[PDB]
């Protein structure tokens, strides 16, 4: 019995854009949530539906991990029931959300002195998203190209600094429980 792949979920060398947001599933492993809670690197650790201290002794069916790069002013939009450019057009959370939102500053890693335009967000769409929807589009909007680049830079303020964010959306089906907390010797 082993520990979960949370090492490469959080310490990956390249996170995807917010519009093409990455998603992976952990399936059978024992997950140590309390080490992530007691880390000194996370700026925000919000949880909805489940308490993060009780989370180490709750068993689920399977756990997802949605990782992408967002601006500093826009981490507030990753919450159940908010609206904005990314909460509508890029990543939508359900109202009855049962997961946790983890984020941290990454100005020393993701920004570039000449400008880093390798992260994209959807500026235009005809309608907002259903919860946990993903799209990739290229067609011209009824006037524009919907994808636009951020332009991160270390000189820029905290609202314009790149923030890497990971969303752990737990599930509970009628399948047997696999992802349990570490039982204590």
């Amino acid at each position, epitope marked *: 019995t082993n520990l979960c792949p949370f090492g490469e979920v959080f310490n990956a060398t390249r996170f995807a854009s917010v519009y093409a947001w990455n998603r992976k599933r952990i399936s059978n492993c024992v997950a140590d949530y309390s080490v992530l809670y007691n880390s*000194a690197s*996370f*700026s*925000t*650790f*919000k*949880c*909805y539906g489940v*308490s*993060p201290t009780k989370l180490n002794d709750l068993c689920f069916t399977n756990v997802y991990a949605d990782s992408f790069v967002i601006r*500093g*002013d826009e981490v507030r939009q990753i919450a159940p029931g908010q609206t904005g450019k990314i909460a509508d057009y890029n990543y939508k959370l359900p109202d009855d959300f049962t997961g*946790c939102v983890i984020a941290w500053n990454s100005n020393n890693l993701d920004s570039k002195v000449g400008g880093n335009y390798n992260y994209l967000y959807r500026l235009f769409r005809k309608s907002n998203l259903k919860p946990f929807e993903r799209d990739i589009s290229t067609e011209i909007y009824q006037a524009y190209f919907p994808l636009q680049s951020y332009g991160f830079q270390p000189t820029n*303020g*905290v*609202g*314009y600094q790149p923030y890497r964010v990971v969303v752990l959306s737990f599930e509970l089906l009628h399948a047997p429980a696999t992802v349990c907390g570490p039982k204590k010797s």
Partner: antibody
Amino acid sequence: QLQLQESGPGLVKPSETLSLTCAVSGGSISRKNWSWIRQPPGKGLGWIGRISGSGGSTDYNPSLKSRVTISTDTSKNQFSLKLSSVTAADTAVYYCARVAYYEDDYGYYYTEGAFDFWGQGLRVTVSS
Amino acid sequence: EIVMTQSPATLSLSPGERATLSCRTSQSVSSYVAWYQQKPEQTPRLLIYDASSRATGIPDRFSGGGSGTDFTLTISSLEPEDFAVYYCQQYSNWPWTFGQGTKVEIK
């Protein structure tokens, strides 16, 4: 509960060094961010610099960075402020503060620079 | 440097009335503004963080709002305690700058 109290000399002669020490009590200095805040008499608040609780991530005000060194001493659970070549215009009330942090039952959140907990204020006078 | 200018220098006002204050920045700080209250010769107290959120143990009549370069602090009903000096802060860029201060003066 968390409490901050300053310690230092009330009278500092010019062209010498200045030392202050904020004794954090009721809470651990680690995993937080701490700052030194001045206030001249009859003037608004000013900012000296900040330090991280763990790792020593340290930043200064650009107008005073050639004269200030800020250090963290987690063995005694306290942090200190040092200045050099103080003039007569440096007379101020010095506060030590914690950069805000709100822990709820449903997780926590680190503020990017608001100061929730403050010290009592130690009045430093400079005269020859 | 992001200078922080508060437009009412002295707020002549009566108790129990509406109060309004202003904070205008040189450039955009993106809603990273805190509000403080300072009794004379006493410790400043944080009221608002992130320009729209009340601090822990703050009365409900304190409210802040705004974004960009316009930030306002509104007190719905005064007390005989809340005639003091109010300060406005930014922390978007690294020289963190406070305001010059605005005074609530009793009519």
